[PDB]
Design a protein around this ligand. Sequence first.
Ligand SMILES: Cc1ncc(C[n+]2csc(CCOP(=O)(O)OP(=O)(O)O)c2C)c(N)n1
Ligand SMILES: [Br-]
Ligand SMILES: [Br-]
Ligand SMILES: [Br-]
Ligand SMILES: [Br-]
Ligand SMILES: [Br-]
Ligand SMILES: [Br-]
Ligand SMILES: [Br-]
Ligand SMILES: [Ca+2]
Ligand SMILES: [Ca+2]
Length: 365
Amino acid sequence: QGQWDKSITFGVSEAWLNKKKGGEKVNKEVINTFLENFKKEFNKLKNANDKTKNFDDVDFKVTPIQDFTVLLNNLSTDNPELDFGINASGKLVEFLKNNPGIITPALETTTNSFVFDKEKDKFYVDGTDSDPLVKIAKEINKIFVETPYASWTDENHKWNGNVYQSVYDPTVQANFYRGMIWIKGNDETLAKIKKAWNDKDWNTFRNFGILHGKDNSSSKFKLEETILKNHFQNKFTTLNEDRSAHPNAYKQKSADTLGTLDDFHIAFSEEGSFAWTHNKSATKPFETKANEKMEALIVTNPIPYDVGVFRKSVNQLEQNLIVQTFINLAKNKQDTYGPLLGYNGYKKIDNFQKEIVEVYEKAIK
Ligand SMILES: Cc1ncc(C[n+]2csc(CCOP(=O)(O)OP(=O)(O)O)c2C)c(N)n1
Ligand SMILES: [Br-]
Ligand SMILES: [Br-]
Ligand SMILES: [Br-]
Ligand SMILES: [Br-]
Ligand SMILES: [Br-]
Ligand SMILES: [Br-]
Ligand SMILES: [Br-]
Ligand SMILES: [Ca+2]
Ligand SMILES: [Ca+2]
């Protein structure tokens, strides 16, 4: 059953919380509004129901968390100073494989669908022009390359300080996201990369240089590794093993820096990362040399958006009221926090193995 806890603390990213605009702790203000709205809806639900109206009313707080390992480790201690947080689904699945039932998944986030990827169940087939993942990449290129990202304006792609709204369909919630593989070069180099892909010439492809995220990343490492393995069958075992024998062919960097690196021409990223990346940023994101272009090659198989997880001993009735509070806050447009992270909706997890684990496992196969 677990103990009713009259104080609930959510872990939130440290960097995010202490981040600023104008010298101001903007996110502090956002989180306080969110916490107040949360507390009011929670206790209304709580007190409207006989099953829970006699417990103590609950206060809601946040605490900064350095990174996801700290979140999951600290939740696993089951210390009431940290009761809940929201984690990337793949990383959570891998953690729970190692530590079964140690923490309790309860909330599934959803995100506004991209106009180019509104259907979850599209998977790798053969890497040709007719491949569903290749078709999405071509739709991305119509948005990012044909209408060049560098010339997008806040006004004509509806930048709202958060995302370019014009690349989304808010009326459709996606209970998934994907990674993607970018390629960059002049015309001759792009053709050579595409030829190597088409010919399944892994050595040649790989030697164009691959940028990636950390090896525990789903969307900047593992999902793309799966596509490459499924495409260039028999040519390698794992990306880590391949890198250990070919180290100058790999570098850990964000895809939006690909254009700055002359010895790298392939990069992994979240699908549509440009959609929340302001093109005016001083980092000059996605900039390429004058006679080079960056374009999508293929996206990956889909996995669930982030999952909210509780320390094990929070009372079940309280967990379910907290889940419903997320849902109702989204419905009534009182969630000032979630949409800043891409969380545009929420659902209860009814079956973690089916709804999360099996989905993740199918994608990395
Ligand atoms: C407005 C906005 N939309 C989208 C994002 C991206 N995003 C937030 S949660 C999520 C899924 C989990 O991704 P990540 O935490 O990068 O884990 P990884 O795939 O590296 O394991 C992503 C793609 C964002 N940061 N901001
Ligand atoms: Br209250
Ligand atoms: Br109340
Ligand atoms: Br109830
Ligand atoms: Br503008
Ligand atoms: Br990463
Ligand atoms: Br590396
Ligand atoms: Br990126
Ligand atoms: Ca607590
Ligand atoms: Ca260019």
